Design a protein around this ligand. Structure first.
Ligand SMILES: NC(=O)c1ccc[n+]([C@@H]2O[C@H](COP(=O)([O-])OP(=O)(O)OC[C@H]3O[C@@H](n4cnc5c(N)ncnc54)[C@H](O)[C@@H]3O)[C@@H](O)[C@H]2O)c1
Ligand SMILES: NC(=O)c1ccc[n+]([C@@H]2O[C@H](COP(=O)([O-])OP(=O)(O)OC[C@H]3O[C@@H](n4cnc5c(N)ncnc54)[C@H](O)[C@@H]3O)[C@@H](O)[C@H]2O)c1
Ligand code: NA
Ligand code: NA
Lengths: 320, 320
């Protein structure tokens, strides 16, 4: 028996943002129809960071992603986030592959952002605002242009160097774009928040009617990027109800009792599956609360694995 | 940097049974003292088997063992049980090694049996009987050999050649061993139950006083190996309370309501750390209910990992 070993460089050449988008969309659809299995994430907290286990079964595969988050890592000489995915066969339990999931974690988060805006944002969106111009912002930008012709990009980062680079990246591919303060960047049709802040970075009075917000940054207890008043006034569509409660953009609000569960309109899978309506009026403010789900990592790993067999990419180890 | 890769053949040459028994004994102690973290197991159920995630943090390492069980695997050209352990630095979260845990899982279970008996059986034990003779019997046997001085060995199983595959293996290294059905094997100083049964296979009657029993088989909600009565009459010492009342030897009697918390004497880690006593009478019956802990897998992976670094064994992959 042979287990395929895939490196980050290899995995990067094995999936398309479009492939990632199709896989993530079907994953949401399947989970909402009960055709996917996914236990809650498991945390192992450390003093300098943590590790999380994210197992899932769907589309004919099973797998477990084991990701860490150590902030002091860069100030040290290593990425903050490193992830490994073990892909298995549901019929034999055999470990078909051990791959880098560092890149695909960013990729499939980008893909989800793009799929959520496709279903929730006004069909006429053209102005895209970005609060935070780090790695994830680029992936969100790339997924979104698969679904919208981007008229204008307004970019804000506390690190001006990062906003200018993102702006320059846009122009390079012909997208009109400019660096902008936070209040102005927030004025748009689709607003992508991608910061790891623990206090509001976007004010309610800055958000106009009809805005769709991809709230991506918040993913751990206490993380929070939005003025809670925005939450009260919006149709909130989460990733996974329980993961949003614990660490999504809505965690602080729910914990401090500002909004309840009736305040959550649907999960993105329910909308995609037709179990709940998505955007219903032009005036409403919509929010997609993204936390990252194991079904997205397995779906996407399935594509990397099959494309890997096809191109004879990888190396092999006989573990047993 | 790189991640060390270790095959089952390599791991087998990197850890001795004595190291495993010391690693495991210390893992139980440390955890009883709150010096280790271990969240519950996470399951993924499939039509023909399952996969479980077992993460733990102790001894300066963190790791996740991802292991399956597909009963129809042998008659398909695969072992029923295969497992991989990703071992990590709690400091940077970096995955130091991805190694086989198929062999060690067996090793660390025998080791546990060996440590439990060392603390719970008559210090004069010399007659051992086995109810199973399958893979695990071999590891319990090999571990018990490092603790007590054997003389005779009573061995039974619902197959006969296996009692033979076992008896001669047992004879070959120097201990008089004979096949002897349930009733016969059942009386000894140490009884080692290693079967996947679903209803008692050992009757209250059959067991003499002063017997220490390693109840190793009961692995899930369904099975039991002992006649509930034996329970009502013994020093019951568990692995982890939560896991045993869920799927260990006590889960049925507990689910039926016959025994409860109050009836479990202690955690094996508690006896080792001396927070609870062990045998206190030559007569009393003592049972070690084993379910298998992640902390045992991580504790054993640390030994494999350090010996591998020390002997320059293993291949390397640059995942990122
Ligand atoms: N939901 C998911 O599935 C998912 C997937 C990937 C990452 N994440 C989360 O995304 C964030 C990281 O995105 P990344 O990988 O690009 O990280 P990064 O550090 O490269 O990007 C974050 C950017 O935010 C900017 N920033 C920080 N504070 C700010 C503030 N107060 N206002 C404006 N800009 C600010 C930084 O200067 C940086 O350029 C974290 O919160 C992380 O945990 C979630
Ligand atoms: N608690 C723990 O730490 C731990 C660790 C590993 C395995 N397990 C459990 O070990 C058990 C089997 O070990 P393995 O996977 O090495 O096994 P195996 O299949 O290699 O051996 C089990 C043996 O039990 C015999 N057997 C089956 N039913 C019996 C019955 N009713 N009466 C008498 N003998 C019977 C079989 O013929 C077989 O030889 C399973 O229940 C498994 O879930 C528990
Ligand atoms: Na957020
Ligand atoms: Na048992």
């Amino acid at each position: 028996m042979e287990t395929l070993i895939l490196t980050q460089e290899e995995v990067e050449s094995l999936i398309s943002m479009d492939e990632a988008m199709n896989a993530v969309e079907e994953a949401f659809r399947l989970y909402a129809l009960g055709k996917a299995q996914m236990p809650p994430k498991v945390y192992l907290e450390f003093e300098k960071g943590d590790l999380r286990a994210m197992p899932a079964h769907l589309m004919g595969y099973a797998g477990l992603k084991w990701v860490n988050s150590h902030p002091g890592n860069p100030d040290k000489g290593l990425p903050t986030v490193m992830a490994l995915m073990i892909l298995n066969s549901p019929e034999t339990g055999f470990p078909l592959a051990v791959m880098d999931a560092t890149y695909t974690t960013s990729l499939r988060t980008g893909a989800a952002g793009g799929i959520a805006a496709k279903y929730l944002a006004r069909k006429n969106s053209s102005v895209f605002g970005f609060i935070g111009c780090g790695t994830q912002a680029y992936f969100q930008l790339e997924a979104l242009r698969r679904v919208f012709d981007i008229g204008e990009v307004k970019a804000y980062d506390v690190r001006e160097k990062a906003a200018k680079k993102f702006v320059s990246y846009c122009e390079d591919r012909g997208i009109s774009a400019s660096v902008q303060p936070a209040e102005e960047a927030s004025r748009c049709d689709v607003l992508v928040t991608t910061t790891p802040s623990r206090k509001p970075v976007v004010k309610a009075e800055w958000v106009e009617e009809g805005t769709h917000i991809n709230a991506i940054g918040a993913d751990g207890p206490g993380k929070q990027e939005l003025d809670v008043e925005i939450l009260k006034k919006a149709k909130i569509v989460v990733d996974d109800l329980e993961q949003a409660k614990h660490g999504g953009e809505i965690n602080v609000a729910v914990s401090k009792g500002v909004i309840g569960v009736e305040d959550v309109h649907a999960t993105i899978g329910e909308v995609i599956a037709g179990l709940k309506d998505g955007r219903e009026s032009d005036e409403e403010i919509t929010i997609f609360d993204s936390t990252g789900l194991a079904i997205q990592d397995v779906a996407v790993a399935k594509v990397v694995y099959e494309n890997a067999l096809s191109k004879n990419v990888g190396s092999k180890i006989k573990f047993f």
